[PDB]
């Protein structure tokens, strides 16, 4: 419902703390496909 706030103002994917999980910003900013969303749900993105 936040149609007055643009997606990408001060948001960019920088996962550094495993204690925090937010599987909505990645799917709302970059517009990842269903396969990418299900892959992220199955395994959280861990930077090698």
């Amino acid at each position: 419902y936040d149609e007055t706030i643009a997606t990408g103002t001060f948001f960019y994917p920088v996962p550094v703390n495993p204690l925090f999980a937010c599987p909505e910003h990645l799917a709302s900013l970059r517009g990842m496909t269903n396969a990418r969303r299900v892959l992220a749900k199955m395994v959280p993105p861990i930077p090698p």
């Binding site: 001060f10 550094v16 703390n17 204690l19 925090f20 937010c22 909505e24």
Partner: protein, 96 residues
């Protein structure tokens, strides 16, 4: 600056209260201070004559609280969600 008591207190506060309250979907994000450096140096001085009294009527172009001095920028466009009665003291503190 100080001893380790305040540091360990802040560490235990951040390692308990925040994870306890993060029961939804909130998570850490990033800032854009590099692009926001020429954004926070904004000062609006109302047009008030020297040695003159400012009227308290709600219909006058000298009320920062109301929409009579709404220069858009970013502060007054986020004011719709962050309505806060503020005066020039905060502006001068930010300038300094």
């Amino acid at each position: 600056h100080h001893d380790r008591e305040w540091g360990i207190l802040s560490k235990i506060y951040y390692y308990i209260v925040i994870p306890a309250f993060s029961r939804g979907s909130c998570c850490t994000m990033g800032v854009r201070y590099d692009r926001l450096y020429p954004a926070l140096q904004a000062v609006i001085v109302p047009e008030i004559p020297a040695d003159e009294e400012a009227p308290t009527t709600p219909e006058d172009p000298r009320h920062p609280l109301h929409a009579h001095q709404l220069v858009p920028n970013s502060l007054n466009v986020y004011f719709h969600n962050a309505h806060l009665t503020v005066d020039g003291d905060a502006l001068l503190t930010l300038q300094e």
